[PDB]
């Protein structure tokens with residue numbers, strides 16, 4: 001949902017820059033031209049990671065940022081700082097889009113506006129030979145951002161969440177379905193070869209044997225991190241897998257934080273040395289999105305580096321979200 005119709009929230013002036021002002025859009029804050037919106041006005045909000053194909057009539061404000069990306073000319077939206085003011089996304093009034101004049105607030109207009117997703121380059125050894133599609137009987141590893149979850153954050157006041165450090169690597173799934181055990185990246189099941197990093201990590205921590213021991217239809221989902229993976233923020237030597245979720249294939253449901261933690265303990269008790277993403281204290285939710293984003297900055301798995309952020313998974317395993325550190329996004333312009 002890169003481009004959606006949203007509502008201008010609080011509009012606050014930026015001291016010393018009378019030509020612009022700060023617009024809150026859900027949990028995001030975004031610099032607009034002074035007077036472009038009033039609180040309550042609707043517009044199209046384009047999230048960071050939007051890639052907006054070149055168009056100086058509709059998008060002249062992006063003109064000097066046009067780059068070549070996957071053979072297209074256009075602009076990547078990313079976190080910026082303007083006059084000391086944090087700015088994320090692009091927010092344009094509805095009258096700039098006459099073809100949306102009878103759409104509704106909340107509508108996803110990504111496809112109609114031709115917006116595509118920008119992503120960092122995938123790391124060398126994490127692209128292997130493809131064996132097949134990512135299994136349709138396993139959920140992929142996505143997380144919604146807290147900035148997009150204002151009402152849900154409200155409903156969940158008092159609920160308890162497992163808090164884990166978000167690790168900056170590549171998503172990796174190792175699973176068992178009856179007589180088949182497979183290793184996947186984010187979007188594909190991979191063939192075992194000598195150079196495949198994901199298979200190597202699954203063999204080295206004995207997690208294939210661990211799945212054979214547990215004898216259940218489970219998908220172990222985690223982050224492979226380390227050297228030549230997204231710049232190796234943790235300064236690891238070699239590479240390693242860090243579990244964050246277990247999907248129950250037979251029940252088509254994630255395991256709860258407590259079910260997952262005890263299964264990981266049994267694996268390690270039996271010699272299967274599967275590591276887990278860092279687990280912090282459980283959080284009783286009673287927070288605004290702004291407050292959640294403030295906890296996002298802090299120590300990573302390597303305590304001497306600042307983390308990508310935090311993932312919150314409710315104790316029933318049925319509601320999860322991610323809070324990315326904005327200091328992290330400011331420091332790492334390649335993501």
Ligand SMILES: Nc1ncnc2c1ncn2[C@@H]1O[C@H](COP(=O)(O)OP(=O)(O)OP(=O)(O)O)[C@@H](O)[C@H]1O
Pocket residue numbers: 049117141142143144164165166167168169170171172222223244277311322
């Ligand atoms: N502790 C954690 N819990 C859950 N996921 C984690 C954790 N640490 C790292 N991750 C990664 O976070 C990803 C979900 O976050 P997010 O939706 O931001 O994904 P993404 O790869 O950044 O995609 P995009 O950039 O397109 O939104 C997962 O796919 C997983 O690889």
Ligand SMILES: [Mn+2]
Pocket residue numbers: 049119
């Ligand atoms: Mn991204």
Ligand SMILES: [Mn+2]
Pocket residue numbers: 142143144
């Ligand atoms: Mn995502």
Ligand SMILES: [Mn+2]
Pocket residue numbers: 167168169170
């Ligand atoms: Mn990531």
